[PDB]
Design an enzyme around this catalytic site. Structure first.
Site, PDB file in Angstrom:
ATOM      1  N   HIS A  76      23.711   8.103  15.224  1.00  0.00           N
ATOM      2  CA  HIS A  76      22.423   8.234  15.894  1.00  0.00           C
ATOM      3  C   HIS A  76      22.562   8.652  17.349  1.00  0.00           C
ATOM      4  O   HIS A  76      21.925   9.623  17.772  1.00  0.00           O
ATOM      5  CB  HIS A  76      21.638   6.916  15.799  1.00  0.00           C
ATOM      6  CG  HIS A  76      21.321   6.504  14.396  1.00  0.00           C
ATOM      7  ND1 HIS A  76      20.588   7.294  13.538  1.00  0.00           N
ATOM      8  CD2 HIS A  76      21.638   5.386  13.702  1.00  0.00           C
ATOM      9  CE1 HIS A  76      20.468   6.681  12.374  1.00  0.00           C
ATOM     10  NE2 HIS A  76      21.097   5.521  12.447  1.00  0.00           N
ATOM     11  N   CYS A 125      18.979   0.500   8.594  1.00  0.00           N
ATOM     12  CA  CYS A 125      17.827  -0.377   8.427  1.00  0.00           C
ATOM     13  C   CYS A 125      17.234  -0.301   7.027  1.00  0.00           C
ATOM     14  O   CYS A 125      16.513  -1.220   6.620  1.00  0.00           O
ATOM     15  CB  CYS A 125      16.759  -0.018   9.457  1.00  0.00           C
ATOM     16  SG  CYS A 125      16.406   1.751   9.511  1.00  0.00           S
TER      17      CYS A 125
HETATM   18  C1  LIG Z   1      21.878  -3.159   7.972  1.00  0.00           C
HETATM   19  C2  LIG Z   1      21.624  -2.699   9.409  1.00  0.00           C
HETATM   20  C3  LIG Z   1      20.279  -2.691   9.685  1.00  0.00           C
HETATM   21  C4  LIG Z   1      19.838  -2.300  10.953  1.00  0.00           C
HETATM   22  N1  LIG Z   1      18.411  -2.291  11.256  1.00  0.00           N
HETATM   23  C5  LIG Z   1      17.957  -1.890  12.547  1.00  0.00           C
HETATM   24  C6  LIG Z   1      16.495  -1.882  12.846  1.00  0.00           C
HETATM   25  O1  LIG Z   1      15.720  -2.201  12.026  1.00  0.00           O
HETATM   26  N2  LIG Z   1      16.044  -1.488  14.122  1.00  0.00           N
HETATM   27  C7  LIG Z   1      17.021  -1.090  15.146  1.00  0.00           C
HETATM   28  O2  LIG Z   1      16.651  -0.764  16.199  1.00  0.00           O
HETATM   29  N3  LIG Z   1      18.443  -1.104  14.838  1.00  0.00           N
HETATM   30  C8  LIG Z   1      18.900  -1.501  13.549  1.00  0.00           C
HETATM   31  N4  LIG Z   1      20.311  -1.509  13.252  1.00  0.00           N
HETATM   32  C9  LIG Z   1      21.284  -1.116  14.280  1.00  0.00           C
HETATM   33  C10 LIG Z   1      21.427   0.384  14.354  1.00  0.00           C
HETATM   34  O3  LIG Z   1      21.666   0.900  13.064  1.00  0.00           O
HETATM   35  C11 LIG Z   1      22.618   0.707  15.259  1.00  0.00           C
HETATM   36  O4  LIG Z   1      22.317   0.359  16.543  1.00  0.00           O
HETATM   37  C12 LIG Z   1      22.952   2.232  15.192  1.00  0.00           C
HETATM   38  O5  LIG Z   1      23.633   2.509  14.044  1.00  0.00           O
HETATM   39  C13 LIG Z   1      23.812   2.595  16.380  1.00  0.00           C
HETATM   40  O6  LIG Z   1      23.889   3.987  16.501  1.00  0.00           O
HETATM   41  P1  LIG Z   1      25.268   4.594  17.001  1.00  0.00           P
HETATM   42  O7  LIG Z   1      25.345   6.072  16.583  1.00  0.00           O
HETATM   43  O8  LIG Z   1      25.383   4.470  18.527  1.00  0.00           O
HETATM   44  O9  LIG Z   1      26.440   3.723  16.314  1.00  0.00           O
HETATM   45  P2  LIG Z   1      27.073   4.004  14.889  1.00  0.00           P
HETATM   46  O10 LIG Z   1      26.002   4.017  13.838  1.00  0.00           O
HETATM   47  O11 LIG Z   1      28.092   2.854  14.579  1.00  0.00           O
HETATM   48  O12 LIG Z   1      27.794   5.372  14.894  1.00  0.00           O
HETATM   49  C14 LIG Z   1      29.170   5.392  15.297  1.00  0.00           C
HETATM   50  C15 LIG Z   1      29.971   6.545  14.534  1.00  0.00           C
HETATM   51  O13 LIG Z   1      31.032   6.843  15.214  1.00  0.00           O
HETATM   52  C16 LIG Z   1      32.216   7.056  14.140  1.00  0.00           C
HETATM   53  N5  LIG Z   1      33.450   6.791  14.742  1.00  0.00           N
HETATM   54  C17 LIG Z   1      33.884   5.611  15.285  1.00  0.00           C
HETATM   55  N6  LIG Z   1      35.149   5.814  15.757  1.00  0.00           N
HETATM   56  C18 LIG Z   1      35.496   7.128  15.502  1.00  0.00           C
HETATM   57  C19 LIG Z   1      36.641   7.857  15.761  1.00  0.00           C
HETATM   58  N7  LIG Z   1      37.902   7.549  16.386  1.00  0.00           N
HETATM   59  N8  LIG Z   1      36.710   9.156  15.395  1.00  0.00           N
HETATM   60  C20 LIG Z   1      35.660   9.751  14.773  1.00  0.00           C
HETATM   61  N9  LIG Z   1      34.520   9.027  14.511  1.00  0.00           N
HETATM   62  C21 LIG Z   1      34.444   7.726  14.876  1.00  0.00           C
HETATM   63  C22 LIG Z   1      31.992   6.227  13.196  1.00  0.00           C
HETATM   64  O14 LIG Z   1      32.436   6.789  11.904  1.00  0.00           O
HETATM   65  C23 LIG Z   1      30.456   6.031  13.185  1.00  0.00           C
HETATM   66  O15 LIG Z   1      29.885   6.761  12.161  1.00  0.00           O
HETATM   67  C24 LIG Z   1      20.770  -1.917  11.940  1.00  0.00           C
HETATM   68  C25 LIG Z   1      22.106  -1.926  11.660  1.00  0.00           C
HETATM   69  C26 LIG Z   1      22.545  -2.317  10.392  1.00  0.00           C
HETATM   70  C27 LIG Z   1      23.987  -2.276  10.232  1.00  0.00           C
END
Ligand SMILES: Cc1cc2nc3c(=O)[nH]c(=O)nc-3n(C[C@H](O)[C@H](O)[C@H](O)COP(=O)(O)OP(=O)(O)OC[C@H]3O[C@@H](n4cnc5c(N)ncnc54)[C@H](O)[C@@H]3O)c2cc1C
Ligand SMILES: Cc1cc2nc3c(=O)[nH]c(=O)nc-3n(C[C@H](O)[C@H](O)[C@H](O)COP(=O)(O)OP(=O)(O)OC[C@H]3O[C@@H](n4cnc5c(N)ncnc54)[C@H](O)[C@@H]3O)c2cc1C
Lengths: 450, 450
Positions: free
Chosen positions: A11, A43
């Site tokens: 995201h 989510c």
């Molecule tokens: C079941 C569940 C329900 C949720 N419900 C809500 C909700 O209702 N409302 C809300 O606001 N939030 C919710 N969240 C939280 C929200 O999903 C997270 O905050 C969001 O996923 C974060 O976005 P991000 O891209 O920063 O992190 P991430 O989704 O963790 O993305 C990180 C990406 O980086 C990749 N990565 C990591 N290290 C490496 C590396 N060395 N090399 C290459 N790639 C790498 C990983 O593969 C990963 O795909 C929920 C989370 C879960 C788990």
């Protein structure tokens, strides 16, 4: 031209890439992602398992093909192995053939997100213990749930709460285990969690709060979970005991909070001015306390990702902080909150008091109405609002966003008690229930002076 | 003891009396009211005629017996005939026996409210032309509705729009006549009222907009209404063409707006420092323009009534102004607004632009979703929000209150585009629809700078 490397793309990386390409179309954007997919809405996992999702393809809003079409060098199934800030290079492994490369960057965007906390508990590597974060974890739980009659959720946060509720309403024997005393203590005070915990009991969910898991032992009849107070046998166990920033690539190289969250300035720049951080990999400015906190929510990821694009070249848009606003739907109740609870405010030594108000949200002469349980946490001396929460069968979710705007502007209980809000019996009483809530806080403050 | 005379008691007077008695328990409070009842909710008239109110007795929240029990000298069925601010005396008539008395006061609370506008149209004094304001008018319409298949509403403001919708959904033939071009143009712009007017046509309501009533003539088969473009026969005509401040008791004695609304300071004091005004008798400070306006809503009456009680002795609590936040339910549609429309903003020569957005309020993968049509009016120079509106079959009423708090704090489209709001698929997308609304306004501003 400027070379930008994005580590991780769910995201925060997705919004950062689109923003960078839109405002700097000459930049060379290379993005690496371990998975073969992006923009998965975790989510929706509990919503599917609870039956509420027909087409799982709708849980994605972007694609690697879309980012490529926008002009990005999309490298899926790649695992970043190292980041060299002093040489401004990155070493990446192609997971499809182990091929390693070393590339240069001018800016690096650290959107590596988080990973579930897996404690050093004996037997936790059992095949009946499952994680619940990404699309891979979801597909496993989707197929494994049909045969797992007994489900045990470990961790009573909002994620663990959603899973237990979703499995309970679909014909499973659910047990909810957590070492903390109450469910979702970060979002709601005891008056709210008492009602929610009663809802779980009324629906047959066994509550095992205040218990610490000690070991997992597999046998033919299922998985045996031993705690310091009891023993349970289940067919499947799900870990929901929080998240940890996935930032070991930069450990010791940029400033971090104790849990590994990357600390940024108001423009999402780390201590290294050429490395940006956004999403679950970073800390957020918590407005009610004016300090950094780890709040891993999708709302922060999409917002900070946008700011990375805004401030890639130079500071342009400041981060507005966050109130950790959240909302949940459990057993036909809407439960929303924003800012500090009373417990958290006192736990951090803040001068805080609380009022609890229950009222029908709209007049009784209407064809139907519904009670809304309201909480407002405030500084009794400055009257500044610190947090609030609402619970009702009626969808009161938008009121938490009203409270978020109040806290963003540092409004007082006196501001909220009299601020103009609409009246029509289809929606509320002459004073909106948010006005009534703040007027109760005024009366509690007044009951103290005399 | 401080002697207080309250002229008129429906909502502003009711809240003023309770507030004065609570904070000055030793005040001699005397209230005069022409009617024999207080606290009637005029919004319930259309709600009953639409079948949504089982017991019309529930349209009251207080009573003369309650105010007397609280310590007030309650004089129902009394008509105040004269006010002398110089000598600080009042002259009252007991409507039960014509008895007249003359009393003095230390402070006078002018909560005389408003009265419907009755134009000098020939035949408008017919017994088939009915007003629609107080409890006496409501009882007449409740009893007449059974014998009035054909209903004609005169005036397409929110009051007439609600009556037309209520009668039409309950098996009445309805004609809606007004000389202005659109329905409810003070709350909504053309994009909203086009859809609203289309709902009336789809439901069989005859829209006679842009027509000017010229005469009412009683006939054998009912009442004949002649306009400049058509002729209509009906069983009942209801006047809904606006309200005038009922302030002739003080005309020429305190400062007034051209329509008679009493002008107050920020503490509800008129130009005579011992005379307070609250509710439909007064003008309100309109925050989007920072000027006085006439906005007769129950929201203002209950607020300004409270401020009279707090500022009775000395200035204590300032008035926060108003945004004229309002909301309606017309044909299953929630239609809410706050602040300036684009039309009203340009009509007053304000630098203003508008963006229009339609989106599903929550993600499509959910079991159901609903479109929401959104409007945001803003200054393209300062980016300050001037007003907004939302329309959806999903209850979006609380979002108008969020926009009210935004306007109260003079937030910009940049503040609303990124301010923290909760995300959960049950309620919204990762960005709340209010966030998306302000982000589209940023896009419109961006396409003009380059
Ligand atoms: C079941 C569940 C329900 C949720 N419900 C809500 C909700 O209702 N409302 C809300 O606001 N939030 C919710 N969240 C939280 C929200 O999903 C997270 O905050 C969001 O996923 C974060 O976005 P991000 O891209 O920063 O992190 P991430 O989704 O963790 O993305 C990180 C990406 O980086 C990749 N990565 C990591 N290290 C490496 C590396 N060395 N090399 C290459 N790639 C790498 C990983 O593969 C990963 O795909 C929920 C989370 C879960 C788990
Ligand atoms: C059909 C209808 C629907 C409405 N719907 C809404 C809605 O949905 N939302 C909203 O916010 N607002 C709504 N309103 C407006 C709201 O009802 C008014 O703004 C509210 O009544 C104002 O309260 P008030 O006490 O200040 O004025 P008033 O209601 O006019 O009270 C004034 C009182 O003073 C008395 N009085 C006047 N002169 C004298 C005198 N010489 N001597 C003794 N007594 C006197 C009068 O008898 C009267 O009872 C609606 C109004 C109508 C008419």
């Amino acid at each position: 031209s400027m070379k930008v490397t994005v580590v991780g793309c769910t995201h925060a990386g997705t919004f950062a890439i689109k923003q960078i390409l839109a405002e700097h179309p000459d930049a060379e954007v290379t993005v690496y992602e371990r998975n073969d997919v992006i923009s998965f809405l975790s989510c929706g996992i509990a919503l599917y398992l609870g039956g509420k999702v027909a087409d799982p393809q709708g849980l994605f809003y972007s694609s690697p093909e879309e980012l490529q079409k926008l002009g990005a060098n999309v490298q899926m199934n790649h695992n970043v192995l190292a980041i060299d800030p002093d040489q401004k290079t990155v070493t990446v492994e192609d997971l499809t053939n182990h091929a390693q490369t070393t590339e240069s960057y001018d800016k690096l965007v650290m959107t590596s997100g988080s990973w579930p906390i897996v404690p050093k508990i004996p037997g936790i590597d059992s095949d009946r213990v499952k994680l619940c974060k990404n699309w891979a974890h979801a597909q496993a739980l989707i197929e494994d749930a049909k045969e797992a009659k007994r489900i045990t959720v470990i961790g009573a946060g909002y994620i663990g709460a959603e899973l237990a509720e979703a499995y309970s309403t679909t014909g499973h024997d659910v047990t909810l285990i957590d070492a903390m005393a109450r469910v979702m203590p970060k979002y709601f005070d005891a008056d709210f969690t008492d009602v929610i915990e009663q809802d779980y009991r009324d629906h047959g969910v066994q509550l095992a709060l205040g218990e610490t898991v000690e070991s997992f032992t597999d046998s033919a009849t299922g998985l045996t979970i031993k705690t310091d107070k009891n023993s349970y046998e289940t067919d499947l166990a799900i870990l929901c005991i929080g998240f940890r920033p996935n930032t070991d690539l930069l450990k010791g190289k940029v400033d971090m909070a104790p849990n590994g969250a990357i600390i940024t300035d108001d423009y999402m720049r780390s201590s290294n001015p050429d490395i940006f951080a956004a999403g679950d990999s970073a800390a957020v400015h918590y407005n009610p306390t004016h300090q950094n906190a780890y709040i891993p929510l999708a709302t922060n990821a999409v917002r900070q990702g946008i700011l990375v694009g805004k401030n890639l070249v130079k500071p342009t848009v400041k981060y507005m902080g966050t109130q950790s606003s959240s909302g949940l739907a459990l057993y036909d109740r809407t439960i929303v909150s924003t800012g500090l609870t009373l417990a958290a405010a006192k736990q951090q030594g803040l001068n805080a008091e609380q009022v609890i108000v229950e009222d029908n949200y709209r007049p009784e002469f209407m064809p139907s109405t519904e009670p809304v349980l309201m909480s407002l946490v405030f500084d009794p001396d400055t009257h500044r609002i610190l947090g609030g929460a609402l619970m009702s069968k009626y969808d009161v979710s938008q009121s938490a966003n009203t409270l978020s705007v109040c806290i963003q502007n540092e409004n007082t209980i006196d501001d909220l008690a009299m601020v103009d809000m609409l009246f029509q019996p289809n929606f509320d009483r002459p004073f909106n229930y948010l006005n009534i809530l703040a007027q109760a806080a005024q009366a509690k403050v007044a009951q103290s002076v005399n």
